[PDB]
């Protein structure tokens, strides 16, 4: 179709205060190039980029959302749930 499809790659679990790496690299678009990746880590922090990093300050479950936008302004979103624990 003409819409990009967003995919979030990351770890299902992680540690308080450690950098967690996420990626949007599996996102695809058959009708354009993906030009931007916008991240919301679910604790109020945001970032951008094909890859992103965040350290959570408190243990808990968090919903991470990625929005991809392509070269014709078309967008797609996807979510990823991570459990962060005290190690």
Residue numbers in the entry: 685 to 771
How is this structure described in the published paper?
Clostridium histolyticum collagenases ColG and ColH are segmental enzymes that are thought to be activated by Ca2+-triggered domain reorientation to cause extensive tissue destruction. The collagenases consist of a collagenase module (s1), a variable number of polycystic kidney disease-like (PKD-like) domains (s2a and s2b in ColH and s2 in ColG) and a variable number of collagen-binding domains (s3 in ColH and s3a and s3b in ColG). The X-ray crystal structures of Ca2+-bound holo s2a (space group C2), Ca2+-free apo s2a (space group P61), Ca2+-bound holo s2b (space group P21) and two new forms of N-terminally truncated wild-type apo s2 (space groups P21 and P212121) are reported for the first time. Comparison of crystal structures of ColG s2 with crystal structures of ColH s2a and s2b suggests that despite common tertiary folds, PKD-like domains can be grouped into two subsets.
Despite being solved in two crystal forms, the crystal structures of forms I and II of apo s2 from ColG are similar. Each asymmetric unit contains two noncrystallographic twofold symmetry-related molecules. All four molecules are virtually identical to each other (r.m.s.d. of <0.5 Å). Each structure begins at residue 685, although the first two residues (Gly-Ser) are remnants from GST-tag cleavage. The last residue is either 770 or 771. In apo s2, intermolecular antiparallel β-sheet interactions involving β-strand A could suppress dynamics of the region. Conversely, the PKD-like domain of collagenases consisting of multiple CBDs, such as s2, appears to have no surface aromatic residues. In contrast, the subset containing s2 is likely to be different; the lack of surface aromatic residues on s2 suggests that the domain is less directly involved in interactions with collagen. In this context, the spring-like dynamics of s2 may allow it to swell the fibril.
